[PDB]
Symmetry: D2
Subunit: 392 residues, 4 copies
């Protein structure tokens, strides 16, 4: 299959790519890959473990190996022997210039960039560029996945976001103020008939205009926001207090990371997307609102080794308060990369089984799952096993 | 309803008793009580929230208030106002002398004791004493719950444990070597037709002889070993790594507590019951065996504020290792006491709905659930909701 | 001795007062009191353990017992038996209306207040009120200690802060914009010849104008900002990495607390004082600057049980990075209250031994110690033992 | 200078050796090296940073590179580029067969071994072998350092350990029962006039017989037991509670590690040396005894990444209890290796300045410092700076 990755030179994207090749060549195991769990035995009928890559970027690099090597040099998150072994393959992956339209002050932190809007292009002329890039690449086993830096909350609009005719009136009118890059790549993927998933908390396809598009076109789509680390523990651990009839009175989450993702999210406007996609979640599981703080702070020595500290204060019998603490030390790109591969495969599956519109049943992968109030990791894994069973 | 509690002067038992009265008088909330969750709306038809208490003890105290006050003085785990309010009621709860038969070197740590075997009695004469105590107390809404100190592994016997005729040949023969106190109270409860649960990891009713008894007599029973704190997190958190196709390569659990339970478990022979009821659990959820250490150490300053430190080391994508830590700070008797009340109510329910034999469906409450390989807290809560739905 | 406490109805102040009486009546031990360590044997010649209290407040309460009881009700940070025992004594402690001048947006969080400036008074007329309150109270064994909510950074001024003639030209001119409440109480204490310490990070006496005053008047003074919890660990633990020739590359401190102090510091302008009095400290011990973040977030369930989470990332041999974590769970008022008593006693001592100006040698008590680059807790404890030895 | 290392193929030893060469070739920094702190400017007059290595081993390997590579393969605790760069130099380091005499059941865990006693040799004939190995190597700038696996407590003897004439009567008599390998290498180093340090908690030179020897021969010696990680925090952090007049009521230390050191210490008899060299330390700083547990458990996934979890429970004002937690994640060989280099250099220094007998002033490096009750890391660093100042 083919996968077009927006943000193709990022750490998640490049580590998905390193990983795919390394497993393909049989020099790495298949751990971390949900689509390789036994209950999904049979998936390789529809989405075999075979990948070719392309994508959009705004940072300047020769190819995807150079990009992979840049993150590796800092993180050493896979062996030098893997890098060497996948070099050749990754050198032939060359991203295309995308659009950083309304992608926040955070984008400054990425250094050297070049974008389509900086060429002067109108919305319609950018859309055309994006679609040309993908369609030239795409086939009938192609999926577009967004793994680009998180954008701030978009400029509000019922007219331009509320319907597909309204969204297309935006492009027609060249009303840049209401378009964000991630809306345009999602728009482009769906107009071309390709499945789309958003691994970031940027709006993407989560606006009505694009939900309506995906359905008309009969195209499956999923998101938003990969649930990979702290929030996975949170949606796995919060249920417990509910099952035991306890009140969570406060829950603190503090995350520190560096590298590009930590840099970008170091901006106030970009940060806001991720902190509000991480605060309403307790309520969806407990039905009420504990005092819940969630913070991201930049901390450069850690690079992609995002580390989180949470503290859960909770009432139990007689209303006596008690305490729980945890700490997560993992590299974000390792928890994230095989999920891109699973999501893709599950997308191809769903496309082949005639699925269209939000694949709500893929909530298991995401912090802000579209078109569903099922947040509890256990309930989401069941919904996912049962979804796939019904369609196999 | 009535509840006969073995170890009636313990902290769990006395805090169940304080709590029951305090809620009865409407001066405490119903938090921590699973039987009060909305899905169990309707239970109060069969097991209303109304309790009268009795039990067996070996430590010497005037009544259950004096006992409650002793633990309170050290722990202050509920308000002074509650204690005062429940005093009168608890002063009229007077335990009966039980049996510490083959209950380990740990029993020394409890100080002043007196037991039936120390009167010289044979097995048959002790059995008679125990049954006389309970039957005089019991009615048709009576349940017997074991909350006594944890016993070591019992002396092995196919003949005497393997069948009810064989177990009764033990009593007949006065073969003390093969009987443990907790087998005799379980034997007595079931011979009298009362439901029984074991909140401790001592054998209790978990031997074939007594499983066969409960069935013949048409009596429901549940256990073993209340899952209240660290192990609840463990069976709630371990699934996550499985759902995400990760390998847990090692898992460390270290617990420190004091007070009587920490004292008794400070012995090598008594400790062994609890550490082996806490080590095989990962396998039942993951299907393989991480390196898993589980320790209990005495630490007197903590009293009943058992605190646990766990560390989970796990492989993910490409086999990169990563780390998770947690720490649990809670008072054991607060996490444990409403469960005694739930278990009782669920026992009365099950009795009334004609249930007999192991109530496997109550696995949710226990670390060593009898007659079931369902350990995952999520799966156990579902099995419990569905059990009760089918019978309501 | 007498102690006038600014913020006399706060938790620190009231718990110093509860504690002093409880020890006086011999119903509490002398733990937490540095002035009671054996190397300070002999201090009771100059500052016996005997206290009478007064102070300034802006929150409305009948007396210091009602105030003590308010914090106790929420925190239960000492026994009910102590409260009862010290009631009478504390009921006869009645604060006087002070001034909240330029004390930040945070002051809103304290609810019901009344202040001198709200009566309309000029600077000179407020100064007069403050001095009248204290002088009526004071004797020759009186010390004034500031334990009031933290103020934001004051409005900058060389003219009005730079000299005593300049500061007094401020009062004369009624230039409120450049005066903060804590400058006026410090000004008043020193004009009356009383020793002063600042337990908060508000400017207090730490401006040149007031340093010059204290010297002229021959009056000892100390500050700023009680080092009681996290920062005590930080100045005790940071040296270690230096002694071992390691580079600290990043150090994260995150604090969560509630109650009034957490409320007030919940404001952006008030928070700023405490976060900049907690960030430059590493450099003073290591001589360079690790990436250091320090945050305070409001978290109401904790009340005065401020809890902190720090993470220290550091290079060692060959430049390999390694990790250290800690967590502090303590009630702030317990760590803070005996220090008020020590500081006072050490102030009276110093006054009697003819000491004047900044008592740099009391750095051991403070996060921002005036007139000294000695931050390392070990070095500060030595400087303090040696100071007192030289004067005894 | 030359350094003879007992246990020359261990991770500490080989990483000291990798490190020394890598710094020598100017491809690594001098971090972690206490002898390179500015207060020891001038040391390179007496002990320049220049090293040649030799040592005794019992595990079978071709040279010190193969040994270094074995630990590296598992731990990757320095770059591949360093290994390659130091290869040649390390290939020419070939250990000599030593003695595992009375070195515990733990020694089984090391796999393939060969030892002098297994050749049949008497004590006198082994001593001769050991001395021949070292003397052939030694010069006038040679030091012998013990970095071999920890031995159990030795078989008790006043006669044979109590005096040098008595110890030599042991060798003479061939009374193996009372000799441990580490006593014989220490005996040999000192008879040859070489300085000796013990980086392990095995007796070494810490018996009177060998203390008397070192003095007669005018030879400096130091130990025991490198204080590198958890215990360094403990002797840095414990003072704080004392300075603040608090009572530590309990202190828990739990360590988990793997690799050879964790394997060997996995034995009950070997473990005992390290747990009793880690329990009496609090008293030497606080003057009383908190409840203190200290444990080591094997945990193979961690290899040399020893991780520790401590919990400190302590009374403060009014006797209110409060809590502190910490966790140490570091690789033991990184914290340990430059100390071998410092200790050596400080040994050569001391030898040249005519120092003889225990160098008590090197306590700073060790968990069980000989001939001194100075345990507090701050006080030990001062004693060390002042020692060196007095002699420079
Ligand atoms: N565990 C995780 O790594 C995790 C979890 C949840 C969500 N995410 C989201 O995944 C995304 C990528 O994560 P990462 O850690 O690889 O970050 P990264 O910054 O290294 O990668 C993002 C890449 O996208 C590029 N980019 C930014 N805006 C773009 C645009 N509008 N068009 C085309 N390219 C653009 C950047 O140049 C960069 O190369 C981030 O939004 C992150 O928040 C990551
Ligand atoms: N969260 C929890 O508190 C928790 C969790 C799981 C299991 N448990 C089990 O619950 C039991 C009670 O816990 P606790 O903390 O109240 O301990 P506890 O020691 O205070 O109470 C046990 C009581 O039983 C009595 N006893 C001991 N052996 C007896 C015998 N054979 N016959 C009659 N009485 C006997 C003791 O005297 C004591 O009063 C222990 O086995 C414990 O391991 C507790
Ligand atoms: N461990 C600690 O508790 C700790 C450590 C370092 C510094 N401090 C500082 O101590 C101070 C008091 O701490 P707390 O926890 O008791 O807080 P608190 O809010 O309960 O007490 C402060 C009291 O001062 C009063 N106040 C505020 N501004 C005033 C003004 N300008 N004039 C007169 N009264 C005023 C408030 O009404 C309140 O009653 C805070 O600044 C705090 O930041 C506390
Ligand atoms: N931070 C630390 O690494 C640390 C801290 C304090 C003490 N120590 C002590 O340092 C010693 C070495 O630590 P390591 O982690 O390198 O362990 P390691 O097991 O890898 O190295 C010890 C080496 O000594 C050899 N050996 C064992 N007994 C011997 C004998 N009697 N004669 C000659 N060789 C022998 C072993 O074969 C091995 O190669 C251990 O005692 C350890 O407890 C280490
Ligand atoms: Na870690
Ligand atoms: Na705690």
């Amino acid at each position: 299959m083919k996968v077009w990755l927006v943000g193709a030179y990022g750490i998640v994207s490049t580590t998905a790519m390193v990983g795919a090749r390394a497993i393909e060549r049989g020099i790495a195991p298949k751990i971390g890959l949900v689509s390789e769990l036994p209950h999904f035995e049979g998936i390789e009928k529809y989405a075999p473990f075979s990948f070719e890559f392309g994508g959009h970027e705004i940072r300047l690099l020769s190819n995807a190996y150079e990009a992979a090597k840049e993150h590796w040099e800092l993180n050493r998150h896979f062996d030098r022997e893997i890098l060497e072994a996948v070099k050749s393959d990754l050198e032939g992956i060359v991203a295309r210039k995308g659009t950083a339209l309304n992608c926040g002050s955070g984008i400054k932190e990425l250094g050297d960039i070049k974008t389509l809007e900086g060429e002067g292009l109108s919305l319609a002329e950018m859309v055309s560029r994006i679609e040309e890039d993908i369609k030239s690449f795409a086939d009938d086993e192609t999926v577009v996945i967004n793994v680009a830096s998180t954008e701030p909350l978009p400029n509000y609009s019922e007219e331009y976001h509320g319907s597909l005719e309204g969204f297309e009136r935006m492009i027609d009118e060249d009303r840049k103020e209401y378009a964000s890059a991630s809306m345009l790549y999602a728009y482009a993927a769906l107009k071309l008939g390709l499945p789309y998933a958003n691994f970031t908390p940027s709006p993407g396809s989560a606006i009505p205009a694009l939900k309506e598009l995906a359905e008309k076109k009969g195209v499956p789509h999923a998101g938003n926001d990969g649930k990979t680390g702290e929030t996975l523990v949170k949606t796995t651990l919060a249920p417990m207090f509910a099952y035991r009839n306890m009140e969570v009175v406060g829950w603190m989450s503090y995350n520190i990371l560096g590298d590009y993702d930590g840099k970008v999210l170091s901006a106030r406007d970009n940060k806001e997307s991720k902190v509000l996609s991480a605060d309403k979640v307790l309520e969806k599981m407990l039905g009420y609102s504990p005092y819940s703080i969630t913070e991201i702070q930049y901390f450069p020595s850690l690079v992609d080794n995002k580390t989180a500290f949470d503290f859960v204060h909770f009432k139990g019998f007689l209303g006596k308060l008690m305490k729980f603490y945890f700490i997560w030390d993992a590299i974000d790109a390792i928890v994230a990369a095989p999920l891109i591969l699973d999501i893709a495969r599950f997308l191809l599956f769903a496309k082949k089984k005639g699925v269209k519109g939000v694949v709500k049943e893929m909530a298991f992968f995401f912090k802000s799952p579209m078109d569903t109030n099922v947040i509890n990791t256990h309930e989401q894994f069941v919904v996912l096993k049962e979804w796939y069973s019904n369609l196999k």
